[PDB]
């Protein structure tokens, strides 16, 4: 359990792994993005580049698939989405290593979550903020990665939330190459699964019931090849809800709750899956990270607890 200091001057808001697992990018509240790499010799994380990205606190970053190159998204509270591509011929830890590409200003609200699409849908992207409007950005031109065109625009909430009331938004894509395109969208106390219809426009396909309070994290379990899909929900209650989605509007799909654990006694902040969807890591308000696995049954039981 060796710790490493990211060197930020403020809070760290989102940390994401890349596809290969040897790189992490750490956004923060001091408007900086620091990209760390794993040295194969020293076996320790070290900084690759640090640069000032936005004009407000950055709350969500996401790596793109390496078949599209080294692209890092960044959503922040200044209503901007900044896309960064790595220049191979540039000095380490200089600030000019990652070159700015686009600034999607189509959102009239402070954003919360940005999530790249899987590697079977294109170089798409998703955004959600305190405006109730879902925005999808496709990079339709492979020649230049700067003509990011908005293609879908679905409204999730009827009205934007109040200035003082707190609210959270999170996104999770479905990484199944052999299923219609789905998007798990969380807005306050609502979690909706969209689906790409035959007309090219997303429609409300299935709504996850429950969720008496704010939803802090949605993670779609990786489609390893099973006949059922899983969504992990970290609510503002103690509940780590796991939904069993079975698909059979191209195709109808049913939502069934698989498990509901009150084993944290507080707000569940982040819930996240493994590569194969076997280990579920849930972090809650008790200061402890609980791992979950399924043994001899479909219902998920608890495992090692890390404090």
């Amino acid at each position: 359990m060796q710790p490493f200091d990211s060197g930020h001057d403020d809070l760290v808001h989102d940390v994401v792994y890349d596809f290969y697992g040897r790189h992490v990018a750490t956004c923060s509240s001091d408007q900086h993005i620091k990209v760390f790499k794993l040295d194969k010799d020293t076996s320790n994380w070290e900084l690759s580049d640090s640069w000032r990205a936005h004009d407000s606190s950055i709350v969500a970053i996401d790596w793109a698939s390496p078949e599209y190159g080294r692209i890092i998204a960044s959503a922040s509270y200044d209503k901007t989405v900044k896309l960064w591509e790595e220049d191979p011929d540039q000095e380490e830890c200089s600030g000019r290593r990652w070159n700015k590409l686009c600034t999607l200003n189509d959102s009239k609200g402070s954003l919360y979550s940005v999530k790249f699409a899987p590697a079977h849908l294109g170089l798409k992207l998703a955004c959600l903020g305190n405006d109730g409007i879902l925005r999808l950005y496709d990079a339709l031109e492979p020649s230049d990665l700067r003509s990011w065109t908005l293609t879908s625009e679905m409204k999730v909430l009827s009205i934007p939330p109040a200035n003082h009331l707190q609210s959270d938004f999170c996104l999770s894509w479905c990484p199944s190459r052999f299923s219609p395109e789905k998007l798990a969208v969380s807005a306050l106390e609502q979690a909706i699964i969209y689906q790409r219809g035959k007309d090219g426009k997303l429609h409300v396909a299935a709504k996850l019931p429950g969720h008496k309070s704010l939803i802090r994290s949605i993670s779609w379990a990786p489609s390893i090849g099973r006949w059922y899909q899983l969504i992990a929900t970290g609510c503002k209650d103690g509940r780590i809800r796991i939904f069993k989605i079975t698909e059979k509007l191209q195709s109808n799909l049913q939502v069934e709750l698989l498990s509901e654990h009150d084993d944290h006694n507080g707000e569940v902040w982040s819930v996240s899956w493994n590569l194969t969807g076997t280990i579920l890591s849930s972090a809650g308000d008790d200061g402890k990270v609980r791992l979950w696995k399924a043994t001899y049954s479909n219902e998920f039981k608890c495992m090692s607890v890390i404090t």
């Binding site: 390496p66 078949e67 599209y68 492979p142």
Partner: protein
């Protein structure tokens, strides 16, 4: 000699996957290796790693590239 990409009329991801190495699935832009029988790219490092251990094209088209790259 100028290297010319095949202008394939594509719609989705294969437009992006046309200019990708067949060993690492990364975009190739400098120091490539081109076969003649099969029209597939490789990086120079990817080619020098793969042909120390392999015998066919890494995309699995069935082309014996050590004997058919001319």
């Amino acid at each position: 000699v100028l290297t010319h990409w095949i202008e394939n009329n594509e719609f989705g991801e294969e437009k992006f996957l046309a200019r990708n190495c067949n060993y690492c699935d990364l975009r190739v832009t400098r120091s490539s290796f081109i076969c003649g029988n099969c029209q597939h790219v490789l990086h120079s490092s990817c080619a020098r790693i793969w042909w120390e251990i392999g015998d066919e094209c890494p995309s699995g088209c069935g082309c014996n590239c050590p004997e058919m790259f001319d």
